[PDB]
Design a protein around this ligand. Structure first.
Ligand SMILES: CC(C)[C@@H](NC(=O)[C@H](CS)NC(=O)CCC[C@H](N)C(=O)O)C(=O)O
Ligand SMILES: [Fe+2]
Length: 329
C-alpha cells in the first residue's frame, strides 16, 4: 500500500576536487534528484559517521536531569531567557519522547559583534561540564566544521546544477557568521510508548512529527539505520529507505523561494517507530544579512519578480512558524 521513494546515492567526492567536468556530472545528478522527489543520499563524503554516532550516544545516555535543567532552552527553563535556539530540549516522561541538544556556530562568543549587538537568532552555545562529558565539546565543535565543509561542497554542486558559478551560494556561507545549527536528536525506545507522543495523520499513519517544509537553504542529515522518513508526492507519501553510511540531503524553503519553486522544498514527515535511534541534522543557514536575488531557471533571462528576502528575517519567522504548526520540540 505504501510505495518507496526513489532516492539516488550520489558520489559527491568530485565536488572536493578540480576536475570541472566530473563536478558537472555530479551537478546533473543533484538537479535530477531535486526535480524528482527532492531527496538524495550523499556518499563518499569523507565524514567519520561512526564516531559521530558513538559520541552522540554516549552523551544522550549519560546526561542527568540536573544537567538537562542547566542546559535547557527558555521553553523548559524560565531562567534562560537568552536560550531560544541553543541548548537542551527536554523530553517529558509519559508525554513527550523526543529530546535533543542544539548548538550553533562555535564562533558566536560573547565578543562576537552579532552577540554584542544582540542580533536576533544569534546565541552563544551552552555546554555540559567537561569533567562529566570529557571530549564532548571538542568533538561537537569539530563536527560542526566537518559538516560545514561537506555542506560548502554540496552548495557548489547546487550552484552548478542551476547554471551559476560554483560560489553562487557558498560565498554567503561563511564561518564567521553562518546561522547554521546542528541538532543531536534522540528518539528513544519506550515500553509502554506514551500515546501523547504519537500523532495520527489524516491517512491514518502514526507519526512522531507532522508534515513540514524545512527552514533552511539545504538540510544535511545523518540518521541511524531505522526507516522513518516519508516524502509527499502527488500520489501520496512514499517511504525513504534508511542508510546509516550516507547523508540525506534536501532543499529547504529558502531554496524554493530563490528559484521560484524550480527546486521545491519537499514536504516530509517522520513515522512513529518504537526503536532507539538518532537523527542528527545540520541546517545550512546563511548569514543574518545574506540576500540572494531570486531568479527563475525556466526563463531564458532568469527574471522572477519575487522579492529578495534577507536570510535573518526568513529564519526568525520560519523557526517560530514551525514551532506554532508542529509543536515545541
Ligand atoms: C526530520 C529531521 C530533520 C528531524 N526534525 C527536525 O529537526 C525538525 C524538522 S526539519 N526541525 C526543527 O525542529 C527545527 C530546529 C531548528 C533549530 N532548533 C535551530 O535553532 O536551528 C527529526 O528527526 O525529527
Ligand atoms: Fe525536515
Amino acid at each position: 500500500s505504501v510505495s518507496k521513494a526513489n532516492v539516488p546515492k550520489i558520489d559527491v567526492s568530485p565536488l572536493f576536487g578540480d576536475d570541472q567536468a566530473a563536478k558537472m556530472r555530479v551537478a546533473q545528478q543533484i538537479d535530477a534528484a531535486s526535480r524528482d522527489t527532492g531527496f538524495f543520499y550523499a556518499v563518499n563524503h569523507g565524514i567519520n559517521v561512526q564516531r559521530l554516532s558513538q559520541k552522540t550516544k554516549e552523551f544522550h545516555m549519560s546526561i542527568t536531569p540536573e544537567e538537562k535543567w542547566d542546559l535547557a532552552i527558555r521553553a523548559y527553563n524560565k531562567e534562560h531567557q537568552d536560550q531560544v535556539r541553543a541548548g537542551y530540549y527536554l523530553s517529558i516522561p509519559g508525554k513527550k519522547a523526543v529530546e535533543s541538544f542544539c548548538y550553533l556556530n562555535p564562533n558566536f562568543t560573547p565578543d562576537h559583534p552579532r552577540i554584542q549587538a544582540k542580533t536576533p537568532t544569534h546565541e552563544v552555545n551552552v555546554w555540559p561540564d567537561e569533567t562529566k562529558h570529557p571530549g564532548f565539546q571538542d568533538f561537537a565543535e569539530q563536527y560542526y566544521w566537518d559538516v560545514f565543509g561537506l555542506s560548502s561542497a554540496l552548495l557548489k554542486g547546487y550552484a552548478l546544477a542551476l547554471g551559476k558559478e560554483e560560489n553562487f551560494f557558498a560565498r554567503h556561507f561563511k564561518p564567521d557568521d553562518t546561522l547554521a545549527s546542528v541538532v543531536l536528536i534522540r528518539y528513544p525506545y519506550l515500553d509502554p510508548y506514551p500515546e501523547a507522543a504519537i500523532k495520527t495523520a489524516a491517512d491514518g499513519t502514526k507519526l512522531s512529527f507532522e508534515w513540514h517544509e524545512d527552514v533552511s537553504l539545504i538540510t544535511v542529515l545523518y540518521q541511524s539505520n531505522v526507516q522513518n522518513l516519508q516524502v509527499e508526492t502527488a500520489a501520496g507519501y512514499q517511504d525513504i529507505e534508511a542508510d546509516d553510511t550516507g547523508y540525506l540531503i534536501n532543499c529547504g524553503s529558502y531554496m524554493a523561494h530563490l528559484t521560484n519553486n524550480y527546486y521545491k522544498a519537499p514536504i516530509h514527515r517522520v513515522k512513529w517507530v518504537n526503536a532507539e535511534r538518532q537523527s542528527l541534522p545540520f541546517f545550512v543557514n546563511l548569514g543574518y544579512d545574506s540576500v540572494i536575488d531570486p531568479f527563475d531557471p525556466r526563463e531564458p533571462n532568469g527574471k522572477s519578480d519575487r522579492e529578495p528576502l534577507s536570510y535573518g528575517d526568513y529564519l526568525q519567522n520560519g523557526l517560530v512558524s514551525l514551532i506554532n504548526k508542529n509543536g515545541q520540540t
